[PDB]
């Protein structure tokens, strides 16, 4: 089996210590600030709505608590992942300070891992955003992160926000030169970026009408 890690929401010394442990154990770490779809596992210090966490869920990666690696260190090899998944009872029942956002994030990680891995062995490639064709109009500080997140779950991110693209688009997300009302007039879902995360975080997410951008309202 392949053991290609990323790391997220960890102290620098934790990251250094774990990079060394993972290599010692025979795995690899992708040391990038951004999400990389080549990875198979991620160890997360704190479940957050950041690029690595959400994109790992969208693709159904193993999303693991740090005690995983400590059990690996003891065993002298990579142990079974199940009891160390953030969404598992073994982790959730023992930890404190987990707020509702984090619990939802942890549970979603496990749920999407299960869903996607049953489709892999069935021979289909299909993340959380499969079938989505997306126009992004988001803060430049954040756009590339959303694009990778969306792509990780199998969405097509369309190039640009020109009106001609609206007929190909299913979703237009914004958190803010884009003619939104024009897209809405064509029944493109014109939605706040929060929908992306809640879509992953929730078994049954609220109706899209709850996330409508201002120009798309009634």
């Amino acid at each position: 089996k392949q053991y290609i890690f990323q790391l997220s929401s960890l102290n620098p010394q934790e990251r250094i210590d774990y990079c060394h442990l993972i290599e010692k154990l025979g795995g690899l770490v992708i040391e990038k600030q951004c999400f990389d779809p080549t990875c198979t596992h991620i160890v997360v210090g704190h479940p957050l709505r950041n690029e690595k966490y959400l994109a790992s869920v969208a693709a159904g990666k193993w999303v693991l608590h740090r005690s995983y690696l400590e059990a690996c260190r003891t065993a002298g090899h990579f142990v079974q992942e199940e009891d160390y998944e953030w969404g598992s009872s073994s982790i959730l029942d023992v930890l404190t300070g987990i707020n509702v956002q984090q619990r939802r994030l942890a549970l979603a990680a496990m749920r999407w891992r299960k869903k996607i891995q049953q489709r892999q062995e069935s021979g289909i490639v299909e993340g959380a955003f499969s079938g989505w064709k997306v126009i992004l109009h988001v803060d430049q500080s954040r756009e590339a992160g959303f694009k990778r997140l969306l792509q990780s779950g199998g969405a097509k991110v369309l190039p640009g926000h020109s009106v001609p693209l609206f007929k190909e688009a299913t979703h237009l997300f914004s958190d803010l030169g884009v003619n939104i009302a024009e897209a809405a007039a064509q029944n493109v879902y014109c939605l706040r970026t929060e929908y992306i995360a809640d879509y992953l975080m929730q078994e049954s997410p609220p109706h899209v009408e709850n996330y409508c951008l201002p120009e798309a309202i009634s």
């Binding site: 929401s9 950041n50 958190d175 995360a197």
Partner: peptide, 10 residues
């Protein structure tokens, strides 16, 4: 932490 990757949200 300053060393945790910022969220994609306010």
């Amino acid at each position: 932490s300053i060393y945790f990757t910022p969220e994609l949200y306010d």
